[PDB]
RNA sequence: GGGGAGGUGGAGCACGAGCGUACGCGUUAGGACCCGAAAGAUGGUGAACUAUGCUUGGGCAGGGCGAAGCCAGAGGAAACUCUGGUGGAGGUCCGUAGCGGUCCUGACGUGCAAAUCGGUCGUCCGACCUGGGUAUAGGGGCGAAAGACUAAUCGAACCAUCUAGUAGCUGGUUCCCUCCGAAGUUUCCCUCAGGAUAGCUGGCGCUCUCGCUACGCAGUUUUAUCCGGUAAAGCGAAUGAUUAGAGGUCUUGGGGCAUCUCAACCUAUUCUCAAACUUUAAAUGGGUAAGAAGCCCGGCUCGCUGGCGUGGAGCCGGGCGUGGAAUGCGAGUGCCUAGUGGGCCACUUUUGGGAAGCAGAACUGGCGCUGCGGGAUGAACCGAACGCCGGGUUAAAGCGC
RNA sequence: CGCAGGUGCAGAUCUUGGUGGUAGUAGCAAAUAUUCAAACGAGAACUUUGAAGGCCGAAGUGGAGAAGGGUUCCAUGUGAACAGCAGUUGAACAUGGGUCAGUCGGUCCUGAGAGAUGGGCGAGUGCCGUUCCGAAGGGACGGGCGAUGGCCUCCGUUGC
RNA sequence: GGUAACGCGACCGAUCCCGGAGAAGCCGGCGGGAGCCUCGGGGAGAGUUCUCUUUUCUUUGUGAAGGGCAGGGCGCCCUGGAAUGGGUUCGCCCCGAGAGAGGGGCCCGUGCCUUGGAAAGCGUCGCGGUUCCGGCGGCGUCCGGUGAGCUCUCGCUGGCCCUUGAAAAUCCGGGGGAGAGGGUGUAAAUCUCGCGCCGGGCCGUACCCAUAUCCGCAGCAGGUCUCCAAGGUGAACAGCCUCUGGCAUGUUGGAACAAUGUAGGUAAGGGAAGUCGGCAAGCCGGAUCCGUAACUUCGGGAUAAGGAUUGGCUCUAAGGG
RNA sequence: GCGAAGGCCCGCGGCGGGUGUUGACGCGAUGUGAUUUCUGCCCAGUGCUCUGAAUGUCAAAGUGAAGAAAUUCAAUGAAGCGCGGGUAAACGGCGGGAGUAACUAUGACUCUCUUAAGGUAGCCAAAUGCCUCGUCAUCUAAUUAGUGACGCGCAUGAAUGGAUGAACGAGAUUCCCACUGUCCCUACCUACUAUCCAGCGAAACCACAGCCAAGGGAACGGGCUUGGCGGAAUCAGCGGG
RNA sequence: CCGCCGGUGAAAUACCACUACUCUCAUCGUUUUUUCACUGACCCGGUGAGGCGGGGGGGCGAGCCCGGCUCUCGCUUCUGGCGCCAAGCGUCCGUCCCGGCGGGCGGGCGCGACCCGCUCCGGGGACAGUGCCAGGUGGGGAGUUUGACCGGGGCGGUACACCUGUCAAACGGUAACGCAGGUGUCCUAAGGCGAGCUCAGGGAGGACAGAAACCUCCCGUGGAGCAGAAGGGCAAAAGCUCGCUUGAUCUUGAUUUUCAGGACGAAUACAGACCGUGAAAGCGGGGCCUCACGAUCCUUCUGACCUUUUUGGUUUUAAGCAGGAGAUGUCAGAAAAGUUACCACAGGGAUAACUGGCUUGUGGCGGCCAAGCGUUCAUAGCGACGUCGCUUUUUGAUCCUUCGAUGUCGGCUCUUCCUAUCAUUGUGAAGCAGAAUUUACCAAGCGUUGGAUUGUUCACCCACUAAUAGGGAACGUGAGCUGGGUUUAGACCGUCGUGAGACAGGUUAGUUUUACCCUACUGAUGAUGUGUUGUUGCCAUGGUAAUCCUGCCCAGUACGAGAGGAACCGCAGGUUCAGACAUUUGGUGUAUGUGCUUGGCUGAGGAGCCAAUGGGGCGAAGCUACCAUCUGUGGGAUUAUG
C-alpha cells in the first residue's frame, strides 16, 4: 500500500501552519530582577486579532530598567483589559485582572490564564479563548502548588510559575454553529491544510486500513493498540471505552 | 605381531595399452540455433500539463425576491398589534463575460482535432475564476476519494544500465542426388503442452559360416506332451433367482362351522434365468521336446548323503554318424545413437451411454509417412504399393452418351 | 592439390531500401459574397488601383502590450523548390538595411521560499540546519597621542 | 506673527529615544471631477436638391512643472450654552466629553485662468520654388445647455468575517541638549530659502501577440495572461443594424440541382396510437394590471396555477430649478 | 488520545524535523451526515483498555553447585500470554424448542438449549422479497409498469444509524393538461455536399483471385466433383457475401 | 527414684550426641533489591547569560527585656506624561596662566552605585537519554507460496500408495470419475510345536423348561469356523480344547512379485548359529494364502578391549563404521493462504461460453393393435395396456471447425422459402335436418391486424377480423439501425466473507469505428456481329398479380315441432395489394410573386436594402397524398373428387 494521510502530515510540506499574517508569539515577558523582587508597570496600547487564534492579543509596552528604551510585549488578553490600562508584573503586583503574579503569592481559588508549565517559561497553559486554570493549594515547604487545568486534570507545579489573573478573552466561540461549509473553509484557511476530511471507509484499501469492500464498512475493530505502526494507528487510539458516556470520566 | 580353512562385499589380479595429437558425432555449462514476455533491481531526470498548500497581482453586465435597522400613521383602554414607506442581507433566484460540460447516446469518427464542433444545458459574490512566483518526486508526492492526477505514459512515471534477463510456450530455421528408416507405447517424476527410462531407428564395425572352376535360426505346420474355465451348455447337479399344478402329513397355524377346507412342511415333477454361479465344456490360445551339449561302456574324486559294493554330483579315458519330422533361410555379437513418447480409422470381440462422425479397451491390418486403378467427389473402403521407358496381360471395377 | 569459414533463403505480423494495384480514386464542403473596369506582365478567377455589393459591429475580423518566437520587421529583386489550385504574391529564396533613454523597465528591497559559514551528522560524494552548541562589530559623533600635505598664523589626510 | 486651529522664504545642533509615511480585505450606497455620449446655436468644407429640407455629414486644442481661483473634504480652532429637544442623510448618524448659529484654520486640488501659448497643431482658401523647403500668406480654431446616462478617478459613509485582509529597503517629523559661534564687527557658526556650475555609467528596446510569426509534427475550427471600447433599439458589455478602423469568406474555382446524407423549415385530419422511454422537436416565453393552492423548517413554495392588456396617431393631468 | 521528558506523524542520521508564531473553546485520530423525532437488547466471540495479583509460563545477563574444563544442573526469573475488569455512537450479533385463552385460525402468562441476547420502536414485494407478474384497492378498454395498503420480512431495522421531511436537483420513475411529423404516412422547399469538369492528389487493404446449386471434404467452397452456364471497357448507387 | 524391661510401653528411653518438617532472635556474614538526600557527568527552559548565596551598614518599622536583643522591608499601584550618556561631595595634577598657599582655565581618580563567596539563572538528575545484546508485539513494510487427476474449469469425489471378485474375449498382460467391495489396523497369541476332539443344522427323547437354558442318542462333505473385504484352501484339518514355549530371535548370499527386469514393500527356497515342541519322523525363522506401508540429509538408541580427533601422549568431547527407530498418505518422499469487475504476459480451438455437423434421451408431430368411451355401437369422433416411426421451430449429450477475434439478447426494416392449412378456391365423412361445428383430401396462390404491461423471446388481456396458423433462411438480418437488457471500469442495498472481495439477486449512470476494392443486386453508357447508317417490326428467353369481405335480392324461403335459419344466378359497394395521375380538395412554396409589419440604414418624401430565408398573410407553375382522382383481364391440360 501507499503511505496514508496521517503519515503524510509529518513531512510538513503542504500541512504546515499558515503564519504569514500572524502577529508573533504571544507570551509573557522574560523573568528578570524586577519581576523576581518587586513589580514593573506596563501600558496596554492595542488589542489586536491574531489569524488562526480565537483569543485576542494585547500589545503591552514596558520600560527597560537597564537602558533607555521601551519594550513591546504580546500577551494573551485577559477578558476585561482595555487600552490605556496599566498592567503590573512581579511578585509584589496586586491581585487584579491582567496582572502577572507568581502562583505562590496567589490565594486559593484564584483564576489564572497563560500559566507557566515550568519556571522561566513565558506562558504555556490555559491560553485558548475562554480557558483558565484554578489554584487549589500551596505547599510552602516544598515550594509547590496544585493547579486544575481546563481539561479537569490536576497538576503540581513550582510556586514560582507566573500567570495572568482572569480568563482568556473570546469565550463562547464554540457556542455559535459554523452553519456553512464555506465558514469552515475560511476558518482553516488561516490555520493549516486539514479541513475537508475524507473518510477511510470511502477510500481504497491501498490508502487506508478501512478502505475497500463492496459495502462501506470498517471490517475490523476501530479500537487500535498504542504500539501499532504509523500506517496502522487509525480509528480510536488506545480507547479505554467506547460509546455514549453516562456521567463524567476522569483519571 | 604374523599365518590356515570356509562363505560373501570390491569400479580388482590372473605376461600390460596407454599417452600425445587431429577429425566426426552426441550430452551439457556458457547470449548458446534466431526473434519474442508480463516482471525484478541499481542510479538518476521531471510539478512548462495536472493534484494540493503558500506568496504576489488581475477579474466577475443587467434584472427578481426583499433579512435586520430606521420613519410616519392607525388603532386599543392599555397590552401590544396592524398599515404604508425607507433599507439593502444572502455559500439567494433569472441571466451575460468567465468557469464547466447534461442530452441529442446529433456532427466528425484514415477528423479541423491522438477528445474537436453545433444546438441544448450547470454555475455565475463565492467552498468563485485566473497569470506569475514558490513547495511537495516514484512504493514517493498530491488527492472535497474517481485508484483520480503526477508533461498524450499511472492498480507505482520517465531515462540509462544490470540485459542478448528466463520462457516445459508461438513463429522461422538457406544447395543437389543416393541408401536406410520411425513414434505417439512401459515405469518414475508437484509428472498431464515437459522430461528421465525401456521400446521402435540409423551409423560404425567386428566374429564366423556355405559354395564353385552349413555354425544355427524361424510371427509356419506336423508329431508327442502339458496348461486353461471364455463361447456353449446346466439348474428333475451345489450357490443364488424363479412359474404352475400333483401326492402325502408332525402341524407352539388360520378360517368357516363333530369337524372340513386353506396355509405350512415334505416328496416326485414342471416354466424361466446368472459379468461378479457351476458338475460339464469347446474353437482359436500359451509352454516344452523332436540328439553329437546325444547315447552307450570303463575308471577316478568328494569333507555332501549313508545299513551297504548306498546315492548324488564332478572329473578322466573309449566306442557309436542312417546328422534322428516338413518347409524356408547365412548367422552371431559390441559400441554410439537421433526422432518419438497428442494419435486416428476398419473387420471381429468388448465396457459406459437411448445414441453419436461420443468416451474407453483386445487382436490384426491400415492412415499418419503413400502416390497409383476403381468407389462421380472423399485420409482410412476395394484392388495394388512407386527408379526412367516400349510391347503384352490382368486385379478391383466396368463397357447407352 | 590441400587449408579455413561470419559459406547457399520464399516465408520468421523477419530487418533496411525500392516499387505496384487500389487510383487520376477518397478528397481539396465549419464561421452569408462577390462583380465591373484598368495597370504591370510571356502568362491573371486569386496581385495592385478605382468603382459597386457585403461582412467583423467597440466582451470586433479594431488599436496596443506580457509570456513565447528570434529577424519572422523594412526596401529591392527572383519566381528553381515550399505556401495541398494559381500567383506578377508571401511570414519562401537572394541582396542590403533596421532597435539610440539619468526621468520606460532591469538593475535596488523584501515576500512565499531557497541557501553557505559556525555546529552537528555522515564510509563517502556530501546532508541537516538559518540562529540554533560561534570570541560572529574592521564602523562612527567626538576627544586625546603622533606623522604627513596644502591658497602652510591655520586647516586638512593618515596611523595609535 | 496669530487667543487658537496654525501661518511666514530660510529659521544651528551629535550619540540616544519615540513616532509617521512606504503599509493594506471584500461588498454596498451616495456625492465631486474629468473623458465619452446628448441638445440648442455660430464658422469652414462636403453630400443631397425629381419634390422638400434654412437641411444632413465632418471638424471646431492647449503637455509637464510653477502661480492664482473655483470646487470637495475635515473626530481642526474661537465665541456661546441647547427640552417646547434640535441638527441632518437616499440610508444613517450627531450633540453639556459642547448641538444649532456666527467667524476662522488645514488638506487635496487630475477642474478653470495664467507663464508655457501660438511662434506650434488642426481646418479651409490661395501663392511659390522644385521632390523637398516643419516653404509663404489670409481667415478660423466660437457661444451656450443638459443628465439616477457609461467609464475612470477622488471622497464620504455604512455592511460582512470562529476569514481582520504582507515585509523590507527608503524617506521624514518630533523629544533631549552633549556641542559650536562672536564680542558689537558690519561680525561668526549656521541655513531643509532664491538663483548659478558639473555629472548621471551597464543591459533591454525592431516586429507577431494569433482562425498565418507562440504550443499542439503544419498557415491545425484546439489552447494561451491583459489594457481602450462610439450611434440606434432595448433592463443590459443580450441579440439585430450602423460609424472609426479592418477584411476578402478562411489551403481552389466552373457547371448542374440525381439518390443517400449534414444543417434549416413547413405540413391537411388525428394528437404519443411511435418508442425501453415524449428521445427529438414542438408548446410557453418580455413587460403592465389582476389572481395565486397543497405543504412547510413560516424563510418559502411563487414567474405556483389561471386571466386580461400590449400597434400607430392626437390630446389631457401630475410629477421640478 | 494527549498537560509538552506529551499525543499524532516525518527522518539513514544529530533530544534532527511537522503540528507549533500552537496548549484542551487546542492539536491529532475515527464514524455518522441538515433540521425534526428517536437511537432498543447483547461484553459470550474478536479487538481495545485497567489494575487485585492465587499468581502459572517466562529469554539474555547475573547467582550458586558438581567436574579437570569445555560443559551440565538448580534457584531466581521483565514485558507479553494467562487471570480477573471496563467497554457496542468498538468490530459485530439479535434464534428456535416446548408448555396454551368457550367455532376455528390465532394464542400473552411459565421453562429451557447453543456461543451473550433473542429484532424493541419504526419501515417494507422498497434501489433490500427467491417464490412473484405476491394479495386487495386505485389508476386504463386492456397495465409483468405507478401509487396506497397487508402482514411469519429467502435475506428490513435503529450514528454497520431507523423513520420523516419543507427548499433544492443537467439524479431514477408513474400519470394528467397543453403541444406537437414520434407515429398513421409520407410530401415539398432551402443551403452545403455527393455529381460532372480544370488544376492538385492520398490511405487502409492485397497467397492467387473473384457467377451459382448440390456433393463430399477440418462436418457452412471463389477454386475440387457433377450439373447450371460463361461476351470487351466502364459510370452512379448499394450494403447479401 | 529417673528408668526398655510395664497398654503385655507397635520401638516409644532416665542416660546421652545427631538430624528431621515449622516459628522466633540475631550475625563486624554473602548477594540481590526498595526508599530518601547530594552534584559533578547528562538533560530541559530563560536571557543581549543584568543584580545568585551569605555578611553587612544605615534608614522603615513590629515585638521583648530591663540602650540593647530578635525579626521584617527593600524606596515605583488615581491619571493612555518624563525618565540614559550624574548631579553633589572627597582628593591628585598641569610640560597652563594671575597674586608655599590662593584665584582662574583645562584635566584624573574615588564615593555616590557596600563586601566576600568556584559553577550566568532556574528546573530535573545517576534517572531520563545514548550505544550494544536479549524477549514480546509488529500485513506499517518486504519476499514468496497457495498440488494433481478431471467428458472445460470450479464445487463435488480420489479412480493419487495398496488388496478381492468381475470387466478381460479359457496362458500372461489389458482402459474409463466401469461395476461390487476392503485398507492406514488387529494379535504373547489369533506366533511355533504336540496331543485329544469335531463343526453349522436337523430328528427323537428328559422335573420345573416354554420358539430359544442343560442332559442323551441318531443323521450330518463341511452346508460352521479359521478377526477384519472377497476369492481360494482346509475335517483323527488350517477349525475347538488343553500342555509346553518365543523360529515374531542372530547372520551371508540366491530368487519371486511390480519392473527399466533400479528401489521400497511383501514373499520363496537354501546355508551357518542358537533354540522351541514332540517319544519320534518332522515342523517352526510370525499370522493358512493374495493388503495393512516409506529414500537422501538430520536426529536418537544399540555393538566392538573398533577406527580417526591433524607434533607426540593421557582423559573428556566430537567424527566415522553396522543394525533398529523419529516421515514424508500428493504414499520414488517441495517447507506454503486468499482476492482481483483495476488487471498483465506467453499460449491454447489439446478446452468451456454462439452458429454449424453427428445423436434425438427430452421436446414436438405422426402411425399400428383394439380394452373401453360414445343411450344403442371397438374404429362418426376418441382411444387405455402395449408398440413402430418422423422432425430438428425445445432442451440436453458430445467437443469435429473457429481463441495472431466468424461482433452477442430482443425489437425495428425487408426479401424469399417450408407446410405439419387458421382463412379463402375445389372436395370427401359425421353422432352432417337448417345454422354452427368437427374429421379428412388436392392445395402454400393470397392473407394472417391495431393496442395496454414487460428489455424481453414467451405470456396475458383489450378490440376489430375471413382468419387473426406454425416455422426456416449462421437460433436470417449491428460497416442496416437502435442499445432497453446482458456483459468492463463509478456507485447503492440485501445475503455471504475477519478482509481484500463474491452473488448463476435487485438497482442507477455508462464512446456502437471503416467501403473509394471484388462480386451480388439496382439502375446507366456501351460491346461482337449483319459492308455503313436509319425507320418500321418479330421473337428466344427471363419476370409476372390481383385479393378478400360486406349490404340488397334470392327469403324469414328451403330445412325444422318450434326456436331459429341458408345457398347458386343477379345488383350496389368496400378491404388489401398493384400500376398511374394531378381536372378537383389538401400539402409545399425563395416564381423571393404581391400586400402587411419590427429593428436599423440610404438627409426626408418616393424608391429601396440588411437582419446566414427578419417575421407573417395570401399565393402561379411544378412536385406530391387512399389526404383528390383513374384502371386492374382470358384460356388449356389436369389434382382431390364424383
Give the residue among A162, A148, A151 at the shortest CA–CA distance from A106: A162
* Nucleotide nearest A21, from its CA to each C1': D166
User: CA of A149 vs C1' of F425, distance in Å?
Assistant: 113
Helix (H) or strand (E) holding A49: none
User: CA of A214 vs C1' of F355, distance in Å?
Assistant: 38
Q: Would the Cβ of A57 be found within 7 angstroms of any atom in strand E?
A: no
Entry resolution in angstroms? 2.5
User: CA of A192 vs C1' of C37, distance in Å?
Assistant: 78
Nucleotides of F under 7 A from a protein CB: 44-48, 50-52, 74-77, 79-81, 83-84, 121-124, 136-142, 491-503
Nucleotides of D under 7 A from a protein CB: 16-19, 161-166
- Please state how this structure was obtained: cryo-EM
* Nucleotide nearest A175, from its CA to each C1': E25
Tell me which residues have their CB below 7 A from strand B. Answer: A 1-5, 7-8, 11, 13-16, 18, 20-21, 180-183, 185-186, 189, 193, 196, 198, 202-208
- Ordered strands of the A154-158 beta sheet: A70-76, A57-63, A39-48, A86-90, A100-102, A162-165, A111-113, A133-139, A144-148, A154-158
Distances A242 to A97, A209, A222 between C-alpha atoms, Å: 41, 20, 10
User: CA of A1 vs C1' of F335, distance in Å?
Assistant: 28
Q: Would the Cβ of A98 be found within 7 angstroms of any atom in strand E?
A: no
Amino acid at each position: 500500500g501507499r503511505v496514508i494521510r496521517g503519515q503524510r502530515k509529518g513531512a510538513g510540506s503542504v500541512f504546515r501552519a499558515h503564519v504569514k499574517h500572524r502577529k508573533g508569539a504571544a507570551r509573557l515577558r522574560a523573568v528578570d530582577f524586577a519581576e523576581r523582587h518587586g513589580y514593573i508597570k506596563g501600558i496596554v496600547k492595542d488589542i489586536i486579532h491574531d489569524p488562526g487564534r480565537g483569543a485576542p492579543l494585547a500589545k503591552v509596552v514596558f520600560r527597560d530598567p537597564y537602558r533607555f528604551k521601551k519594550r513591546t510585549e504580546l500577551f494573551i488578553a485577559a477578558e476585561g483589559i482595555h487600552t490605556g490600562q496599566f498592567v503590573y508584573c512581579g511578585k509584589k503586583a496586586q491581585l487584579n485582572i491582567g496582572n502577572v503574579l507568581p502562583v505562590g503569592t496567589m490565594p486559593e481559588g484564584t483564576i489564572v490564564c497563560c500559566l507557566e508549565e515550568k519556571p522561566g517559561d513565558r506562558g504555556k497553559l490555559a491560553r485558548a479563548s475562554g480557558n483558565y486554570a484554578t489554584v487549589i493549594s500551596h505547599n510552602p515547604e516544598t515550594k509547590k502548588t496544585r493547579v486544575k487545568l481546563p481539561s479537569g486534570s490536576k497538576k503540581v507545579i513550582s510556586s514560582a510559575n507566573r500567570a495572568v489573573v482572569g480568563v482568556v478573552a473570546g469565550g463562547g466561540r464554540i457556542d455559535k454553529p459554523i452553519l456553512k461549509a464555506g465558514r469552515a473553509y475560511h476558518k482553516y484557511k488561516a490555520k493549516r491544510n486539514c479541513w475537508p476530511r475524507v473518510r477511510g471507509v470511502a477510500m481504497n484499501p491501498v490508502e487506508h486500513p478501512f478502505g475497500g469492500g463492496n459495502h462501506q464498512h470498517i471490517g475490523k475493530p476501530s479500537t487500535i493498540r498504542r504500539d501499532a505502526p504509523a500506517g496502522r494507528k487509525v480509528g480510536l487510539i488506545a480507547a479505554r471505552r467506547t460509546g455514549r458516556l453516562r456521567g463524567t470520566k476522569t483519571v
